[PDB]
Motif scaffolding. Structure first.
Motif, PDB file in Angstrom:
ATOM      1  N   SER A 190       0.792  -1.237   0.000  1.00 61.21           N
ATOM      2  CA  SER A 190       0.000   0.000   0.000  1.00 61.21           C
ATOM      3  C   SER A 190       0.829   1.294   0.000  1.00 61.21           C
ATOM      4  O   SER A 190       0.306   2.351  -0.349  1.00 61.21           O
ATOM      5  CB  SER A 190      -0.977   0.002   1.186  1.00 61.21           C
ATOM      6  OG  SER A 190      -0.355   0.433   2.383  1.00 61.21           O
ATOM      7  N   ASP A 216       4.403   3.375  -1.113  1.00 60.58           N
ATOM      8  CA  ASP A 216       5.635   3.536  -1.883  1.00 60.58           C
ATOM      9  C   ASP A 216       6.751   3.900  -0.912  1.00 60.58           C
ATOM     10  O   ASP A 216       6.674   4.925  -0.230  1.00 60.58           O
ATOM     11  CB  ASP A 216       5.475   4.626  -2.946  1.00 60.58           C
ATOM     12  CG  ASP A 216       6.626   4.648  -3.942  1.00 60.58           C
ATOM     13  OD1 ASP A 216       7.794   4.782  -3.521  1.00 60.58           O
ATOM     14  OD2 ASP A 216       6.362   4.556  -5.159  1.00 60.58           O
ATOM     15  N   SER A 234      11.196   0.055 -16.395  1.00 60.13           N
ATOM     16  CA  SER A 234       9.758   0.354 -16.479  1.00 60.13           C
ATOM     17  C   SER A 234       8.927  -0.913 -16.627  1.00 60.13           C
ATOM     18  O   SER A 234       7.924  -1.095 -15.929  1.00 60.13           O
ATOM     19  CB  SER A 234       9.466   1.273 -17.668  1.00 60.13           C
ATOM     20  OG  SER A 234       8.150   1.799 -17.594  1.00 60.13           O
ATOM     21  N   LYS A 266       2.466  -2.393 -12.416  1.00 53.53           N
ATOM     22  CA  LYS A 266       1.652  -1.494 -13.249  1.00 53.53           C
ATOM     23  C   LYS A 266       0.542  -0.848 -12.420  1.00 53.53           C
ATOM     24  O   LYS A 266      -0.564  -1.389 -12.312  1.00 53.53           O
ATOM     25  CB  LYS A 266       1.040  -2.232 -14.456  1.00 53.53           C
ATOM     26  CG  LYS A 266       1.968  -3.169 -15.218  1.00 53.53           C
ATOM     27  CD  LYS A 266       3.165  -2.459 -15.824  1.00 53.53           C
ATOM     28  CE  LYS A 266       4.051  -3.458 -16.545  1.00 53.53           C
ATOM     29  NZ  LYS A 266       4.808  -4.321 -15.589  1.00 53.53           N
ATOM     30  N   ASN A 267       0.844   0.308 -11.835  1.00 52.42           N
ATOM     31  CA  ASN A 267      -0.127   1.053 -11.028  1.00 52.42           C
ATOM     32  C   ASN A 267       0.272   2.539 -10.902  1.00 52.42           C
ATOM     33  O   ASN A 267       1.198   2.981 -11.587  1.00 52.42           O
ATOM     34  CB  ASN A 267      -0.327   0.345  -9.671  1.00 52.42           C
ATOM     35  CG  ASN A 267       0.960   0.213  -8.860  1.00 52.42           C
ATOM     36  OD1 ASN A 267       1.831   1.081  -8.894  1.00 52.42           O
ATOM     37  ND2 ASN A 267       1.078  -0.886  -8.116  1.00 52.42           N
ATOM     38  N   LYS A 268      -0.420   3.307 -10.057  1.00 51.51           N
ATOM     39  CA  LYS A 268      -0.182   4.763  -9.943  1.00 51.51           C
ATOM     40  C   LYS A 268       1.213   5.181  -9.448  1.00 51.51           C
ATOM     41  O   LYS A 268       1.632   6.317  -9.686  1.00 51.51           O
ATOM     42  CB  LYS A 268      -1.255   5.408  -9.057  1.00 51.51           C
ATOM     43  CG  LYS A 268      -2.625   5.462  -9.711  1.00 51.51           C
ATOM     44  CD  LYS A 268      -3.742   5.181  -8.720  1.00 51.51           C
ATOM     45  CE  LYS A 268      -5.089   5.597  -9.278  1.00 51.51           C
ATOM     46  NZ  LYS A 268      -5.450   6.977  -8.861  1.00 51.51           N
ATOM     47  N   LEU A 269       1.917   4.276  -8.773  1.00 49.41           N
ATOM     48  CA  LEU A 269       3.249   4.549  -8.221  1.00 49.41           C
ATOM     49  C   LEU A 269       4.380   4.237  -9.209  1.00 49.41           C
ATOM     50  O   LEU A 269       5.520   4.636  -8.982  1.00 49.41           O
ATOM     51  CB  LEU A 269       3.458   3.688  -6.979  1.00 49.41           C
ATOM     52  CG  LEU A 269       2.419   3.847  -5.863  1.00 49.41           C
ATOM     53  CD1 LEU A 269       2.584   2.716  -4.858  1.00 49.41           C
ATOM     54  CD2 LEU A 269       2.504   5.210  -5.191  1.00 49.41           C
ATOM     55  N   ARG A 270       4.061   3.508 -10.281  1.00 51.88           N
ATOM     56  CA  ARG A 270       5.042   3.073 -11.291  1.00 51.88           C
ATOM     57  C   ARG A 270       5.867   4.220 -11.863  1.00 51.88           C
ATOM     58  O   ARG A 270       7.092   4.119 -11.982  1.00 51.88           O
ATOM     59  CB  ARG A 270       4.321   2.368 -12.445  1.00 51.88           C
ATOM     60  CG  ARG A 270       5.188   2.075 -13.663  1.00 51.88           C
ATOM     61  CD  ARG A 270       4.629   0.932 -14.492  1.00 51.88           C
ATOM     62  NE  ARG A 270       5.431   0.715 -15.703  1.00 51.88           N
ATOM     63  CZ  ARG A 270       4.962   0.561 -16.948  1.00 51.88           C
ATOM     64  NH1 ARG A 270       3.657   0.569 -17.222  1.00 51.88           N
ATOM     65  NH2 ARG A 270       5.824   0.376 -17.946  1.00 51.88           N
ATOM     66  N   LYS A 271       5.168   5.285 -12.240  1.00 57.54           N
ATOM     67  CA  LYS A 271       5.790   6.480 -12.816  1.00 57.54           C
ATOM     68  C   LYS A 271       6.790   7.106 -11.847  1.00 57.54           C
ATOM     69  O   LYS A 271       7.888   7.501 -12.244  1.00 57.54           O
ATOM     70  CB  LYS A 271       4.719   7.517 -13.147  1.00 57.54           C
ATOM     71  CG  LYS A 271       3.946   7.236 -14.427  1.00 57.54           C
ATOM     72  CD  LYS A 271       3.600   8.520 -15.166  1.00 57.54           C
ATOM     73  CE  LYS A 271       2.344   8.362 -16.002  1.00 57.54           C
ATOM     74  NZ  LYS A 271       2.318   9.314 -17.142  1.00 57.54           N
ATOM     75  N   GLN A 272       6.378   7.197 -10.581  1.00 52.27           N
ATOM     76  CA  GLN A 272       7.218   7.731  -9.498  1.00 52.27           C
ATOM     77  C   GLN A 272       8.491   6.911  -9.341  1.00 52.27           C
ATOM     78  O   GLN A 272       9.584   7.465  -9.209  1.00 52.27           O
ATOM     79  CB  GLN A 272       6.481   7.690  -8.157  1.00 52.27           C
ATOM     80  CG  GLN A 272       5.202   8.504  -8.046  1.00 52.27           C
ATOM     81  CD  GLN A 272       4.443   8.203  -6.758  1.00 52.27           C
ATOM     82  OE1 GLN A 272       5.028   7.777  -5.760  1.00 52.27           O
ATOM     83  NE2 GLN A 272       3.130   8.423  -6.779  1.00 52.27           N
TER      84      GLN A 272
END
Lengths: 119, 38, 249, 196, 160
Positions: free
Chosen positions: E49, E51, E109, E114-120
């Motif tokens: 849950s 990062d 990458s 694969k979720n909202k924290l991936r980019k971070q």
RNA sequence: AAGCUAAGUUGAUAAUAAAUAAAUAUUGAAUACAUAUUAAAUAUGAAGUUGUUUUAAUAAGAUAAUUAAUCUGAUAAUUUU
RNA sequence: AGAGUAGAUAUUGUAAGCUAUGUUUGCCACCUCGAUGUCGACUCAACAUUUCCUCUUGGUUGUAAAAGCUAAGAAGGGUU
RNA sequence: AAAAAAUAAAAUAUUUAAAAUCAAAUAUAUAUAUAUUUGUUAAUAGAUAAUAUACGGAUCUUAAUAAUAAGAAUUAUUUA
RNA sequence: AGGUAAAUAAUCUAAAGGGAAACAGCCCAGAUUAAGAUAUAAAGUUCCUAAUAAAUAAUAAGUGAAAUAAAUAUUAAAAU
């Protein structure tokens, strides 16, 4: 063939190890069955359990199916078996006259050790 | 060049070569014998 | 005396190696580019009129591009900006119109408050003109070729017939209520949607337009105009860039 | 193997040295590798020239009878064995070039088919049936000379470079079969077809 | 009971250097190793849950190992949506465009969840083709390590 | 008349160059020979490719001003490019 | 095999053989059988490449040249 | 032409096998008698359509020097 | 032929769970309500994604890595 039964034509390493283990287990079961019968027969003659276990001359099973299972020509052990017969059934309609054992239905329960002599 | 799956050397003056991941058959005498494996 | 700092062995003992040059660098892009060897000047499209060649007798429609207070404000360099270009400024503007910040910028560069500013990208550092100087129509030679950038005439929300030269439907023979509504978009089913860039009705004009290899018919510093052969994009009083033609010499 | 085993004869004027490179490079195949470390040189009367070579190879210079040998650390290794025959042959070619010099005669065949030295030797102009002018610059090491207009000679220390240049020159017009007509490098032949 | 205490250090974002010139792993294996670090699986305080993964500075990325003939064969794809716009670039071409660091980033990458924290997580990876980089000064260091490093080199690094 | 138009006017097919497909080569062993490499070196070569070119989108960066007797915008009025 | 002057493999290629394809005529009834887009035209095209032309290139006693024939690469452009 | 000789690097093929033979092992009498079981090919080409590459994706074949450190994540047969 | 006609077995039908990317029928396995320590099944254990390390071969083609495409050609490899 629009419905996709995505089953691979061959087994993984882990699958093969599991199959081998299963084969070994059935041999072990057979051995236990013969051993217990022998022990029982020793007891009937009049030896203790320990004495029976020690005994040099082990009694061979008199019933037919058990006796057949004991024979390696009929029912071979996993160590005896060929690499091919562990992982490949005989299938007359397949090319190569061979098919993965994993393609057999209920292969995890169903036993199939012996293939034909030249197929 | 005869581009084909089968690539056999016809005469004695033909010679097989392996370039670019393709079997070529060149020939020193007859230029018709030039072949290429696909 | 010295400040406290710790440094990792992995970063200290790392053998020094320069990075290889990449295509998507500025300097590589600059090297690639097809650029003119000389600066340009901003103009206004005052209008259009006939040019009669007095030897041959041939008549040619010429647009009159006026050159007023055109001045090299500053210039850009590869080491600072990533490219070589001359920021030219045209005309004169009131104080009232110009922003305080812009006025200060003009004061720093030592020019009058300007009517239009624009860059003119060049190949080398040699192409840069010294800043503060006044560019006159005599910059260009008569008979030379020039590229011409300007914003085209606005045509408003146009249909597919005017936009894209669509044939439209028939005038008679049963045609109902769609004589000009070009039909059949996003194919059908196969795409399942209108594929991007499907030519549809929309706003037209008021976009930039480079016109390449236009001949400088006539140059005169007296009337403060450059005559240029043929048409130029935009209405009257629209700002028009002029630089040497890269294609034609 | 059979080639690499053959010993190379040297005359006192020529010297075959060997030494490690300044920055050795490694050729990486799929499975196998090949590290270019050493750098053989063949200095002589006409000139000097070098061969960058793997680590596994090394010379064996003998004082008696002017012989030198070449051997690899593992002849049973296929890639090494393949390299061995190449390298020996290359250094033999170099020896030949420095002592004698490599040669490549081009004879032009055709009506108005001829060569010309245009830029004082530095550009071989070739006229072989074309409206546009044809030719190419001579590389460094190569010296060209024209005894006749229709018979050019290329000369150099590197057998590779001279014969490449000759091939390039030929490529403007290789010999046609119908009329033996074009540019013939050294002893080049062509089976002429019947006219009919 | 185990959880109770000062947790600030546990959740601290460290900075991890990796000199690719020194590292002997191939590209994909290296990328996989990085991914874990980026996620924060290495640290026991981790929870799905939250990062809580570290920074990874990669350097000398030009010397990255790629097996087979992948450098001239392996194709990187792209597509806008408009048909007939499939952009396929070979690995060497991609390198020429951007660098070996871009290639590494793509791998990393793909490794990541694969979720909202991936980019971070991807952002926290800082890759550099050559040696010199701004984050030189912020890689984790210790006082006991300082004797290994020569005297003037440290000063030069600090100056940089 | 203007405007807009096209029957009209003008412009343009975006070089150079980079690596290449097919194909044509040099030296050259493994494999006495031979072999353009599915060895090491070494070359050419396409309306294709990468670029370039142009259009739009963005906004790294840049110069400039910083609480306003005249700061940057916005509402309002008169209009049009 | 057989043509192809003379030669099976310049070009030709039977009967049989092995594949591919998923365009058509079927075959199946598995979709909804409240899917006209009712099969053709127009408008508009998009996409494939199994290349018609255009560019590169091998062969072509059957390339002298020019026309061609045939094959390779090639879908950028164009194809009343 | 050209052989420290065969023990192994010649050609011409057939072959692609544990049936046979041989080796390894089990089982019986057992100082090794029979019977059963196990042991014999690899890579490339062929390769092939239509919204978009699609092993599920990333990506995976390792390299002394040199990190505590990598070295299939493929196939074949196996171990813990 | 996801065909059709029965025979036999199983599942589905009427079965939740784990596997097979997704998955009526395949591979495991049967939910009374919890709980979650201990064995496991099928299947897996670089990452995404719970979880590993080894031996020995062979492959270089990304062949391949959970949906094995052929006659045939070539180059190898053993053996006779």
């Amino acid at each position: 063939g629009g419905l996709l039964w995505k089953i691979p034509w061959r087994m993984s390493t882990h699958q093969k190890t599991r199959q081998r283990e299963r084969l070994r287990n059935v041999d072990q079961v057979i051995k236990q069955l013969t051993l217990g019968l022998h022990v029982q027969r020793c007891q009937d003659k009049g030896l203790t359990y320990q004495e029976a276990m020690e005994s040099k001359k082990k009694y061979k099973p008199r019933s037919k199916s058990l006796r057949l299972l004991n024979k390696p020509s009929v029912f071979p052990k996993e160590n005896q078996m060929s690499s091919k017969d562990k992982y490949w059934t005989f299938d007359k309609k397949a090319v190569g006259y061979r098919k993965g054992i994993h393609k057999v239905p209920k292969w995890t329960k169903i036993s199939i050790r012996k293939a034909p002599k030249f197929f | 060049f005869k581009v084909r799956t089968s690539v056999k050397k016809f005469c004695s003056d033909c010679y097989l070569v392996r370039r670019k991941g393709r079997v070529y058959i060149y020939c020193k005498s007859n230029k018709k014998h030039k072949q290429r494996q696909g | 005396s010295t400040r406290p700092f710790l440094v990792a062995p992995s970063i200290a003992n790392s053998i020094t190696t320069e990075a290889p040059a990449i295509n998507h660098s500025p300097e590589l892009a600059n090297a690639r580019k097809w650029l003119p060897k000389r600066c340009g000047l901003i103009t206004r499209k005052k209008g259009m009129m006939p040019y009669f060649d007095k030897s041959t007798g041939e008549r040619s429609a010429a647009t009159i591009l006026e050159v007023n207070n055109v001045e090299v404000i500053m210039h850009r360099t590869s080491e600072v900006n990533g490219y070589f270009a001359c920021q030219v400024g045209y005309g004169s503007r009131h104080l009232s119109k110009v922003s305080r910040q812009m006025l200060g910028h003009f004061a720093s560069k030592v020019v009058n408050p300007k009517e239009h500013v624009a860059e003119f990208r060049v190949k080398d550092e040699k192409g840069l003109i010294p800043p503060g100087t006044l560019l006159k129509p005599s910059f260009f030679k008569e008979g030379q070729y020039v590229d011409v950038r300007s914003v085209s005439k606005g045509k408003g929300f146009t249909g597919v017939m005017k936009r894209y030269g669509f044939k439209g439907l028939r005038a008679s023979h049963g045609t109902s209520i769609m004589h000009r509504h070009g039909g059949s978009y996003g194919q059908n089913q196969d795409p399942g949607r209108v594929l991007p860039g499907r030519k549809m009705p929309g706003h037209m004009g008021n976009e930039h337009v480079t016109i390449q290899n236009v001949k400088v018919l006539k140059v005169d510093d007296e009337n403060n105009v450059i005559w240029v052969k043929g048409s130029v994009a935009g209405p009257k009083n629209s700002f028009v860039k002029i630089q040497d033609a890269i294609k034609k010499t | 193997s059979q080639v690499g085993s053959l010993p190379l004869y040297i005359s006192p004027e020529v010297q075959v040295s060997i030494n490690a490179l300044s920055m050795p490079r490694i050729i990486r195949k799929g499975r196998t590798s090949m590290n270019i470390s050493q750098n053989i040189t063949v200095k002589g009367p006409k000139g000097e020239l070098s061969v960058e070579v793997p680590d596994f190879l090394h010379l064996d210079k003998d004082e008696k009878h002017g012989k030198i040998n070449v051997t690899v650390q593992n002849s049973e290794d296929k890639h090494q064995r393949s390299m061995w025959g190449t390298v020996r042959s290359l250094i033999n070619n170099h020896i030949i070039g420095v002592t004698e010099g490599h040669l490549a005669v081009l004879r032009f065949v055709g009506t108005g088919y001829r060569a010309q030295l245009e830029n004082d030797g530095k550009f071989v102009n070739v006229k072989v049936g074309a409206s546009i002018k044809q030719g190419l610059d001579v590389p460094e090491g190569i010296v060209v000379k024209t005894p006749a207009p229709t018979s050019l000679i290329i000369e150099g220390c590197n057998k590779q470079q001279v014969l490449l240049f000759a091939a390039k020159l030929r490529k403007f017009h290789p010999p046609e079969p119908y009329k033996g007509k074009g540019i013939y490098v050294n002893d080049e032949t062509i089976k002429l077809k019947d006219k009919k | 009971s185990q959880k109770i205490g000062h947790s600030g250090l546990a959740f601290a974002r460290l900075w991890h250097h990796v000199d690719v010139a020194r590292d002997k792993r191939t590209l994909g294996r290296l990328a996989s190793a990085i991914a874990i670090t980026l996620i924060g699986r290495h640290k026991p305080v981790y929870h799905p849950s939250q990062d809580c993964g570290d920074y990874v500075v990669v350097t000398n990325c030009q010397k990255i190992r790629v097996t087979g003939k992948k450098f001239e064969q392996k194709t990187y794809w792209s597509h806008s949506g408009r048909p007939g716009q499939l952009k396929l670039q070979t690995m060497n071409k991609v390198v020429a465009d951007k660098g070996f660091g871009e290639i590494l980033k793509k791998a990393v990458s793909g490794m990541l969840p694969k979720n909202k924290l991936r980019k971070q997580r991807l952002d926290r990876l800082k890759v550099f083709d050559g040696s010199e980089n701004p984050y030189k000064q912020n890689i984790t260091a210790f006082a006991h390590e300082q004797s290994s490093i020569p005297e003037p080199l440290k000063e030069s690094i600090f100056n940089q």
